[PDB]
Amino acid sequence: KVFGRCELAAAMKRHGLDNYRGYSLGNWVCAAKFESNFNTQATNRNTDGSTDYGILQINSRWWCNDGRTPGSRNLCNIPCSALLSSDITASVNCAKKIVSDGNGMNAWVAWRNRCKGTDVQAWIRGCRL
């Protein structure tokens, strides 16, 4: 499922991501924009042989299990394919552990490179929330 901007914002707010670890809703939305383009089915292989999965491009080396990644930890205890669902629940719960793991939203290199420090509130402009 390809979410609309305000669609994902409302879902993320409902799952308690707004202000989680102090990161406003615009940050999480911006991150989803530049990680997946709001597409829950997005997958992307990385050079170390891991893959990133779903709306927030969560990595198979540490967080979910895809059966093919050397050194998998599966810290979210979840098949990576569950992060590709139109229900964002599993993706949201896992993002909570990742952003709590020590270096904040810097884990997300599209966030870091394209959202961090910018006018992220723009990413929820016009939304009824």
Side-chain angles (χ1 to χ4, degrees), residues 59-89:
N59 184 262
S60 61
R61 181 184 167 96
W62 307 102
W63 302 109
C64 61
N65 169 252
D66 64 359
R68 77 182 184 185
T69 304
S72 177
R73 306 231 38 193
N74 191 16
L75 284 180
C76 288
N77 189 222
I78 202 81
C80 302
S81 65
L83 308 193
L84 298 181
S85 170
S86 52
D87 186 327
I88 62 155
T89 296

mmCIF file of all heavy atoms in Angstrom, residues 59-89:
data_model
loop_
_atom_site.group_PDB
_atom_site.id
_atom_site.type_symbol
_atom_site.label_atom_id
_atom_site.label_comp_id
_atom_site.label_asym_id
_atom_site.label_seq_id
_atom_site.Cartn_x
_atom_site.Cartn_y
_atom_site.Cartn_z
ATOM 1 N N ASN A 59 16.236 -2.833 8.596
ATOM 2 C CA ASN A 59 17.348 -3.578 8.040
ATOM 3 C C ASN A 59 17.378 -4.994 8.602
ATOM 4 O O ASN A 59 17.243 -5.152 9.817
ATOM 5 C CB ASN A 59 18.662 -2.852 8.329
ATOM 6 C CG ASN A 59 19.873 -3.500 7.698
ATOM 7 O OD1 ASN A 59 20.595 -4.251 8.358
ATOM 8 N ND2 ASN A 59 20.084 -3.237 6.419
ATOM 9 N N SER A 60 17.666 -5.969 7.702
ATOM 10 C CA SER A 60 17.670 -7.411 7.971
ATOM 11 C C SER A 60 18.885 -7.898 8.748
ATOM 12 O O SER A 60 18.966 -9.081 9.073
ATOM 13 C CB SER A 60 17.643 -8.205 6.696
ATOM 14 O OG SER A 60 18.776 -7.947 5.903
ATOM 15 N N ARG A 61 19.873 -7.029 8.950
ATOM 16 C CA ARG A 61 21.082 -7.438 9.663
ATOM 17 C C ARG A 61 20.863 -7.437 11.172
ATOM 18 O O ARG A 61 21.288 -8.369 11.846
ATOM 19 C CB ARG A 61 22.260 -6.528 9.347
ATOM 20 C CG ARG A 61 23.543 -6.955 10.059
ATOM 21 C CD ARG A 61 24.616 -5.932 9.752
ATOM 22 N NE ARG A 61 25.807 -6.022 10.596
ATOM 23 C CZ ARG A 61 26.921 -6.658 10.268
ATOM 24 N NH1 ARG A 61 26.979 -7.306 9.118
ATOM 25 N NH2 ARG A 61 27.961 -6.656 11.094
ATOM 26 N N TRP A 62 20.195 -6.399 11.688
ATOM 27 C CA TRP A 62 19.977 -6.251 13.115
ATOM 28 C C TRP A 62 18.539 -6.522 13.545
ATOM 29 O O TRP A 62 18.355 -7.086 14.612
ATOM 30 C CB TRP A 62 20.389 -4.859 13.563
ATOM 31 C CG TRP A 62 21.771 -4.454 13.181
ATOM 32 C CD1 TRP A 62 22.125 -3.625 12.156
ATOM 33 C CD2 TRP A 62 22.983 -4.810 13.862
ATOM 34 N NE1 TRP A 62 23.481 -3.432 12.159
ATOM 35 C CE2 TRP A 62 24.038 -4.152 13.189
ATOM 36 C CE3 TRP A 62 23.283 -5.608 14.972
ATOM 37 C CZ2 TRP A 62 25.371 -4.287 13.587
ATOM 38 C CZ3 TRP A 62 24.600 -5.735 15.367
ATOM 39 C CH2 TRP A 62 25.628 -5.083 14.680
ATOM 40 N N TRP A 63 17.535 -6.128 12.750
ATOM 41 C CA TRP A 63 16.211 -5.845 13.299
ATOM 42 C C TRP A 63 15.175 -6.913 12.919
ATOM 43 O O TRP A 63 14.466 -7.328 13.815
ATOM 44 C CB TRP A 63 15.762 -4.409 12.937
ATOM 45 C CG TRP A 63 16.718 -3.356 13.431
ATOM 46 C CD1 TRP A 63 17.562 -2.595 12.679
ATOM 47 C CD2 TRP A 63 16.983 -2.997 14.807
ATOM 48 N NE1 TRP A 63 18.331 -1.797 13.489
ATOM 49 C CE2 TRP A 63 18.004 -2.022 14.801
ATOM 50 C CE3 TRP A 63 16.461 -3.405 16.033
ATOM 51 C CZ2 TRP A 63 18.483 -1.423 15.978
ATOM 52 C CZ3 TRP A 63 16.947 -2.837 17.195
ATOM 53 C CH2 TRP A 63 17.951 -1.871 17.169
ATOM 54 N N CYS A 64 15.093 -7.351 11.636
ATOM 55 C CA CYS A 64 14.153 -8.389 11.205
ATOM 56 C C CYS A 64 14.880 -9.525 10.486
ATOM 57 O O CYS A 64 15.999 -9.324 10.010
ATOM 58 C CB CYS A 64 13.121 -7.805 10.254
ATOM 59 S SG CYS A 64 13.844 -7.103 8.742
ATOM 60 N N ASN A 65 14.222 -10.691 10.345
ATOM 61 C CA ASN A 65 14.868 -11.853 9.743
ATOM 62 C C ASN A 65 14.345 -12.117 8.333
ATOM 63 O O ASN A 65 13.153 -12.338 8.150
ATOM 64 C CB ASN A 65 14.681 -13.127 10.570
ATOM 65 C CG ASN A 65 15.109 -14.353 9.800
ATOM 66 O OD1 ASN A 65 14.280 -15.149 9.380
ATOM 67 N ND2 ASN A 65 16.400 -14.479 9.552
ATOM 68 N N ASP A 66 15.251 -12.149 7.337
ATOM 69 C CA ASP A 66 14.836 -12.403 5.963
ATOM 70 C C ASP A 66 15.426 -13.698 5.431
ATOM 71 O O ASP A 66 15.231 -13.999 4.257
ATOM 72 C CB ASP A 66 15.154 -11.269 4.971
ATOM 73 C CG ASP A 66 16.638 -10.998 4.772
ATOM 74 O OD1 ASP A 66 17.444 -11.684 5.415
ATOM 75 O OD2 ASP A 66 16.968 -10.061 4.013
ATOM 76 N N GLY A 67 16.131 -14.447 6.284
ATOM 77 C CA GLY A 67 16.584 -15.781 5.946
ATOM 78 C C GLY A 67 17.832 -15.753 5.085
ATOM 79 O O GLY A 67 18.315 -16.809 4.744
ATOM 80 N N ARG A 68 18.390 -14.586 4.762
ATOM 81 C CA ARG A 68 19.513 -14.574 3.827
ATOM 82 C C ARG A 68 20.621 -13.601 4.245
ATOM 83 O O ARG A 68 21.614 -13.466 3.525
ATOM 84 C CB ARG A 68 19.016 -14.265 2.409
ATOM 85 C CG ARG A 68 18.703 -12.790 2.148
ATOM 86 C CD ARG A 68 18.184 -12.580 0.757
ATOM 87 N NE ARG A 68 17.970 -11.174 0.480
ATOM 88 C CZ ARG A 68 17.431 -10.700 -0.625
ATOM 89 N NH1 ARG A 68 17.081 -11.525 -1.596
ATOM 90 N NH2 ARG A 68 17.282 -9.400 -0.768
ATOM 91 N N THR A 69 20.503 -12.979 5.432
ATOM 92 C CA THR A 69 21.441 -11.951 5.837
ATOM 93 C C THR A 69 22.487 -12.503 6.792
ATOM 94 O O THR A 69 22.177 -12.902 7.904
ATOM 95 C CB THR A 69 20.709 -10.796 6.499
ATOM 96 O OG1 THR A 69 19.750 -10.406 5.518
ATOM 97 C CG2 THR A 69 21.615 -9.635 6.836
ATOM 98 N N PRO A 70 23.777 -12.435 6.429
ATOM 99 C CA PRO A 70 24.872 -12.858 7.306
ATOM 100 C C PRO A 70 24.901 -12.031 8.593
ATOM 101 O O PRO A 70 24.905 -10.805 8.572
ATOM 102 C CB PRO A 70 26.158 -12.595 6.490
ATOM 103 C CG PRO A 70 25.688 -12.410 5.060
ATOM 104 C CD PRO A 70 24.272 -11.886 5.164
ATOM 105 N N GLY A 71 24.862 -12.701 9.732
ATOM 106 C CA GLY A 71 24.994 -12.007 11.002
ATOM 107 C C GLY A 71 23.677 -11.421 11.503
ATOM 108 O O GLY A 71 23.708 -10.453 12.273
ATOM 109 N N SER A 72 22.547 -12.012 11.088
ATOM 110 C CA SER A 72 21.235 -11.525 11.497
ATOM 111 C C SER A 72 21.134 -11.576 13.018
ATOM 112 O O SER A 72 21.602 -12.530 13.618
ATOM 113 C CB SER A 72 20.093 -12.297 10.874
ATOM 114 O OG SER A 72 18.854 -11.790 11.375
ATOM 115 N N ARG A 73 20.530 -10.544 13.613
ATOM 116 C CA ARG A 73 20.246 -10.524 15.042
ATOM 117 C C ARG A 73 18.739 -10.597 15.292
ATOM 118 O O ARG A 73 18.314 -11.149 16.311
ATOM 119 C CB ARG A 73 20.836 -9.274 15.691
ATOM 120 C CG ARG A 73 22.322 -9.082 15.421
ATOM 121 C CD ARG A 73 22.963 -8.861 16.764
ATOM 122 N NE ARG A 73 22.268 -9.742 17.698
ATOM 123 C CZ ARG A 73 22.367 -9.682 19.018
ATOM 124 N NH1 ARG A 73 23.136 -8.765 19.578
ATOM 125 N NH2 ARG A 73 21.701 -10.541 19.770
ATOM 126 N N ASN A 74 17.933 -10.052 14.367
ATOM 127 C CA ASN A 74 16.478 -10.122 14.483
ATOM 128 C C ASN A 74 16.059 -9.571 15.856
ATOM 129 O O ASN A 74 15.362 -10.205 16.652
ATOM 130 C CB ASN A 74 15.930 -11.535 14.205
ATOM 131 C CG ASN A 74 14.417 -11.563 14.054
ATOM 132 O OD1 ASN A 74 13.778 -10.533 13.854
ATOM 133 N ND2 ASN A 74 13.801 -12.727 14.175
ATOM 134 N N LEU A 75 16.530 -8.363 16.140
ATOM 135 C CA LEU A 75 16.263 -7.755 17.434
ATOM 136 C C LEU A 75 14.784 -7.382 17.591
ATOM 137 O O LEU A 75 14.314 -7.240 18.708
ATOM 138 C CB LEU A 75 17.181 -6.539 17.579
ATOM 139 C CG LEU A 75 18.639 -6.860 17.885
ATOM 140 C CD1 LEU A 75 19.462 -5.572 18.008
ATOM 141 C CD2 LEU A 75 18.779 -7.672 19.144
ATOM 142 N N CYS A 76 14.036 -7.216 16.498
ATOM 143 C CA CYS A 76 12.625 -6.909 16.623
ATOM 144 C C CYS A 76 11.834 -8.214 16.677
ATOM 145 O O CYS A 76 10.643 -8.194 16.858
ATOM 146 C CB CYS A 76 12.135 -6.001 15.492
ATOM 147 S SG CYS A 76 12.749 -4.307 15.668
ATOM 148 N N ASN A 77 12.501 -9.337 16.465
ATOM 149 C CA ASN A 77 11.887 -10.663 16.502
ATOM 150 C C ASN A 77 10.684 -10.732 15.562
ATOM 151 O O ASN A 77 9.565 -10.961 15.986
ATOM 152 C CB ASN A 77 11.492 -11.096 17.912
ATOM 153 C CG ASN A 77 11.073 -12.545 17.941
ATOM 154 O OD1 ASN A 77 10.107 -12.898 18.600
ATOM 155 N ND2 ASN A 77 11.755 -13.400 17.209
ATOM 156 N N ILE A 78 10.952 -10.605 14.270
ATOM 157 C CA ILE A 78 9.927 -10.409 13.269
ATOM 158 C C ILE A 78 10.521 -10.782 11.911
ATOM 159 O O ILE A 78 11.686 -10.438 11.565
ATOM 160 C CB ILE A 78 9.392 -8.955 13.321
ATOM 161 C CG1 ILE A 78 8.007 -8.809 12.705
ATOM 162 C CG2 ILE A 78 10.342 -7.956 12.705
ATOM 163 C CD1 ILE A 78 6.918 -9.210 13.619
ATOM 164 N N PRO A 79 9.723 -11.523 11.104
ATOM 165 C CA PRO A 79 10.092 -11.735 9.711
ATOM 166 C C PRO A 79 10.049 -10.375 9.022
ATOM 167 O O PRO A 79 9.119 -9.599 9.257
ATOM 168 C CB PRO A 79 9.084 -12.753 9.212
ATOM 169 C CG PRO A 79 7.940 -12.737 10.196
ATOM 170 C CD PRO A 79 8.496 -12.246 11.499
ATOM 171 N N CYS A 80 11.066 -10.083 8.195
ATOM 172 C CA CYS A 80 11.101 -8.809 7.469
ATOM 173 C C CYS A 80 9.843 -8.636 6.624
ATOM 174 O O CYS A 80 9.355 -7.527 6.447
ATOM 175 C CB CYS A 80 12.350 -8.670 6.601
ATOM 176 S SG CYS A 80 13.868 -8.797 7.581
ATOM 177 N N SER A 81 9.260 -9.733 6.159
ATOM 178 C CA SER A 81 8.080 -9.623 5.309
ATOM 179 C C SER A 81 6.864 -9.052 6.054
ATOM 180 O O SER A 81 5.964 -8.519 5.415
ATOM 181 C CB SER A 81 7.766 -10.948 4.697
ATOM 182 O OG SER A 81 7.410 -11.857 5.711
ATOM 183 N N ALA A 82 6.818 -9.158 7.393
ATOM 184 C CA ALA A 82 5.747 -8.563 8.192
ATOM 185 C C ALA A 82 5.838 -7.022 8.219
ATOM 186 O O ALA A 82 4.891 -6.328 8.599
ATOM 187 C CB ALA A 82 5.812 -9.158 9.582
ATOM 188 N N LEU A 83 7.008 -6.482 7.842
ATOM 189 C CA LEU A 83 7.251 -5.058 7.771
ATOM 190 C C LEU A 83 6.802 -4.500 6.407
ATOM 191 O O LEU A 83 7.009 -3.300 6.151
ATOM 192 C CB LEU A 83 8.750 -4.814 8.016
ATOM 193 C CG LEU A 83 9.341 -5.459 9.271
ATOM 194 C CD1 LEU A 83 10.721 -4.892 9.579
ATOM 195 C CD2 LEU A 83 8.422 -5.284 10.479
ATOM 196 N N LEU A 84 6.236 -5.366 5.529
ATOM 197 C CA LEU A 84 5.798 -4.984 4.183
ATOM 198 C C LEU A 84 4.261 -4.950 4.079
ATOM 199 O O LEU A 84 3.697 -4.597 3.034
ATOM 200 C CB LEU A 84 6.353 -5.974 3.155
ATOM 201 C CG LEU A 84 7.877 -6.084 3.017
ATOM 202 C CD1 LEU A 84 8.206 -7.096 1.938
ATOM 203 C CD2 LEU A 84 8.510 -4.760 2.668
ATOM 204 N N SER A 85 3.599 -5.221 5.209
ATOM 205 C CA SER A 85 2.156 -5.204 5.325
ATOM 206 C C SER A 85 1.565 -3.803 5.155
ATOM 207 O O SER A 85 2.203 -2.782 5.447
ATOM 208 C CB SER A 85 1.820 -5.773 6.669
ATOM 209 O OG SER A 85 0.470 -5.577 6.952
ATOM 210 N N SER A 86 0.302 -3.747 4.718
ATOM 211 C CA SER A 86 -0.399 -2.475 4.697
ATOM 212 C C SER A 86 -0.716 -2.001 6.117
ATOM 213 O O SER A 86 -0.879 -0.806 6.336
ATOM 214 C CB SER A 86 -1.633 -2.564 3.876
ATOM 215 O OG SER A 86 -2.390 -3.666 4.319
ATOM 216 N N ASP A 87 -0.788 -2.919 7.087
ATOM 217 C CA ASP A 87 -0.839 -2.527 8.492
ATOM 218 C C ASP A 87 0.576 -2.180 8.980
ATOM 219 O O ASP A 87 1.450 -3.021 8.940
ATOM 220 C CB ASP A 87 -1.479 -3.623 9.334
ATOM 221 C CG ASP A 87 -1.711 -3.245 10.780
ATOM 222 O OD1 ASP A 87 -0.921 -2.496 11.327
ATOM 223 O OD2 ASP A 87 -2.712 -3.682 11.334
ATOM 224 N N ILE A 88 0.773 -0.955 9.488
ATOM 225 C CA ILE A 88 2.112 -0.437 9.805
ATOM 226 C C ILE A 88 2.546 -0.831 11.216
ATOM 227 O O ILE A 88 3.631 -0.445 11.646
ATOM 228 C CB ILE A 88 2.215 1.093 9.577
ATOM 229 C CG1 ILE A 88 1.287 1.940 10.456
ATOM 230 C CG2 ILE A 88 1.987 1.424 8.109
ATOM 231 C CD1 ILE A 88 1.782 3.355 10.670
ATOM 232 N N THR A 89 1.725 -1.621 11.909
ATOM 233 C CA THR A 89 1.912 -1.855 13.330
ATOM 234 C C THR A 89 3.315 -2.348 13.637
ATOM 235 O O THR A 89 3.958 -1.817 14.566
ATOM 236 C CB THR A 89 0.845 -2.806 13.874
ATOM 237 O OG1 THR A 89 -0.381 -2.093 13.702
ATOM 238 C CG2 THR A 89 1.009 -3.151 15.337
#
